[PDB]
Structure 1
């Protein structure tokens, strides 16, 4: 019933994937070996949403892990939690992508992509109602962009009707861990706009801000940022796993949060995010929880919503919560910040409540926002893309892997139109 199949590509995807299943297995009380030891029956009632089953209680999570070099996956396999995945799911190559989109999309991803579909289809025909696919990758890299966009395009052809949501890392506004991020990112966006139903744009820089600003923990970067991301994506799919007063769904959010086909890039947020030492100095009531969702302090995207206007907003609360407070506060938010919401949409907030909270908490909520302020991000990428491309900065690496500079112009022209479309919805009615 409403089965989801998980895809993770690239080094970032697998690590996020890896911490994505350590959280879910904790919610359902699933031992790393795959043996159930939970306490509440609701965990088993929908355990089939993510986990298959093998006699003896062994629950097999249907994730498909793909990367062009064995490096990262070998770490996951040797991880403490690597004993759970079906060995047949790991799809590993032997020549990783050197951050060039063309290699992971034309010459190297093409050779490995056919193998992955052979593993998706088995996990696709083993589900009685397959709701939609899930994908986690990075635009900047080569494998998360090249093959990720190649794979998302393929699964669109066979499963046009099914949902396909993407949690994707976006290049940071000012810092960069790769030099060719504009080329790779620009090509990736031109390829997602046509295939992906909903995308959750996130960036490390903004997510770094949460670590030291609202939390007080400087030591970790990748062991914990992924855990915030994992909690966020888990919140989105909670309604399909536990009972709720107002149950939501990947299709419900898409309809509510996607006015037009080409405007589907959101920016998530999560709460509560309190430090262990300051937690006892804070109330856990609904009102305060809702206040921090709409502040740029707790936005996992680099774009500040203040500069733009919200088009659609979705909240997915959790735990035993009073639905009156869940609704009075949203009416309060809309009126207080009337300039932050577009007039041509009378209502911009979607609510959903789940009875069971996340592990270690009694209250939580995942924010999903469609704001025109995200156009700044693409605008910025285009500025960087045109500057490098204006002199053919690195095109020789990309042309030499079965590609043409005409595609770059198409990717720049299509990107320019996405920015323009978001800009049209800044004006008010009439």
Structure 2
């Protein structure tokens, strides 16, 4: 069951590149695409993310999209840049100027058909296509605007496939332009309709973790992307290695999404150290559920968990893992909705991530995620009430009505979460 990966825009490609660098190491694939591993568990499910070519080369099933050549030239010149299929580099020249309208309606529309031809070529040779996973940010123009355009057209051609995304949420703490709330609000509505699973990665949380926890006074995007790499590897562990729980995108969605629109997840990772000490299973569990280890910048105690997916990696006592997971739920049962029995599923993988004897990845569908949408909505309204900066968008054909609707759409999403929190 193959997965087709897509990374669009600056953020999507810089994070997408680190993702392939991380999992390529975990599966024993070198920069040239040759396998040099010592465990058959590395190759048992290598097909989910890699294509097998001539000479026993493993080529990532990845499509690199952007309206500017800048970031993609960086990837092609990066460490694992040579591993990507050259034909899968689809890029324009104008750029999107951090403008959702440019990526979704003008500049992006001109290039989207080229991307769909590569997606179709990758899908045609798939024995059993699970679906797609997209990495992108919501505050820019290409990943946000054209990314959601791709999602809509991909759904039209592949309506019976799962759509998964890693979506980086903008934050004034780590901001490039003032229009990011506009772009994020327009994109969130697209994700509410056209994705089955979206990992909400908040640049605010990534910054706080680098600053407060990792002790990085001046965090860079590279430092933020290191957290996303480790998180993306953890959330996809059940897809890349043999297992029983959440082993594919659909079964994951069936376990995690009780209502179609409430499919935005809080990812968490443990440990997060600044390092040679062994971490006990009780410690992994406490940190994994600690708000300080999650990437959405939302307090789980301000809401309730609809569903939870836990993944432990490394050689450890699976009996002790079961005990610790049961202790978390039984000691804090008030934070798990009681009308979804046994809503916490736990998976264990023998192969740990690089540089760690054992780790833990947290995937939570909590109603506290509304705090993230409320935040974006407040910032959006602060400018929209004065129609500030709208000319950048009306100049591309958009009408104010479309902004009013996106605003109302997200306030509905917030109300829907608040409904199930009581």
Give the TM-score normalised by structure 2. 0.95
Deviations 1:25-61 (A, max 9, x none): 1112111111222222232332222121222232211
CA 280–68 in structure 1, closer or farther in 2 if over 3 Å, else same: closer
Hey, what's the Cα distance between the residues in 1 that align with 2:209 and 2:337? 28
Deviations 1:315-358 (A, max 9, x none): 01222333322222122111222232223223331111222222
CA 71–173 in structure 1, closer or farther in 2 if over 3 Å, else same: closer
CA 247–157 in structure 1, closer or farther in 2 if over 3 Å, else same: closer
Moved more, 234-243 or 261-270: 234-243
Q: Are residues 1:299 and 2:294 paired?
A: yes
Q: Name the structure 1 match of 2:7.
A: 8
Hey, what's the Cα distance between the residues in 1 that align with 2:237 and 2:174? 33
Deviations 1:362-419 (A, max 9, x none): 3222100111111122112222222211121122221121211111111111111111
CA 185–219 in structure 1, closer or farther in 2 if over 3 Å, else same: closer
Contact 1:375 1:422 survives alignment (8 Å): yes
Q: Name the structure 2 match of 1:420.
A: 415
Moved more, 155-164 or 352-361: 352-361
Q: Which runs of 5+ in 2 are unaligned?
A: none
- 1:281: Cα distance to partner? 7.6
Q: Secondary structure at the match of 1:52?
A: strand
Contact 1:166 1:196 survives alignment (8 Å): yes
Contact 1:237 1:250 survives alignment (8 Å): no
Moved more, 317-326 or 401-410: 317-326
Q: Name the structure 1 match of 2:180.
A: 181
CA 280–71 in structure 1, closer or farther in 2 if over 3 Å, else same: closer
Hey, what's the Cα distance between the residues in 1 that align with 2:301 and 2:419? 17
Moved more, 86-95 or 379-388: 379-388
Counting matched residue pairs gives 422
- 1:210: Cα distance to partner? 2.1
Deviations 1:219-275 (A, max 9, x none): 65222321221222222222333233656332232122211001011110011222x
CA 173–298 in structure 1, closer or farther in 2 if over 3 Å, else same: farther
Hey, what's the Cα distance between the residues in 1 that align with 2:33 and 2:173? 42
Contact 1:9 1:65 survives alignment (8 Å): yes
Hey, what's the Cα distance between the residues in 2 that align with 1:61 and 1:53? 9
Q: Name the structure 2 match of 1:316.
A: 311
Match of 1:326 among 321, 328, 341: 321
Contact 2:313 2:350 survives alignment (8 Å): yes
Hey, what's the Cα distance between the residues in 2 that align with 1:243 and 1:372? 31
Hey, what's the Cα distance between the residues in 1 that align with 2:411 and 2:275? 48
Hey, what's the Cα distance between the residues in 2 that align with 1:374 and 1:343? 19
Q: Secondary structure at the match of 2:60?
A: coil
CA 175–6 in structure 1, closer or farther in 2 if over 3 Å, else same: closer
Deviations 1:66-120 (A, max 9, x none): 0001011111112232111111111110100011111110011100000001001
Contact 2:32 2:83 survives alignment (8 Å): yes
Q: Secondary structure at the match of 1:154?
A: helix
Contact 1:136 1:167 survives alignment (8 Å): yes
Q: Name the structure 2 match of 1:201.
A: 200
- CA RMSD after TM alignment: 1.8
Contact 1:173 1:377 survives alignment (8 Å): no
| Displaced runs of 4 or more, over 6 A | none
CA 251–325 in structure 1, closer or farther in 2 if over 3 Å, else same: farther
Hey, what's the Cα distance between the residues in 1 that align with 2:323 and 2:134? 35
Give the TM-score normalised by structure 1. 0.93
Hey, what's the Cα distance between the residues in 2 that align with 1:380 and 1:214? 23
Contact 1:173 1:380 survives alignment (8 Å): no
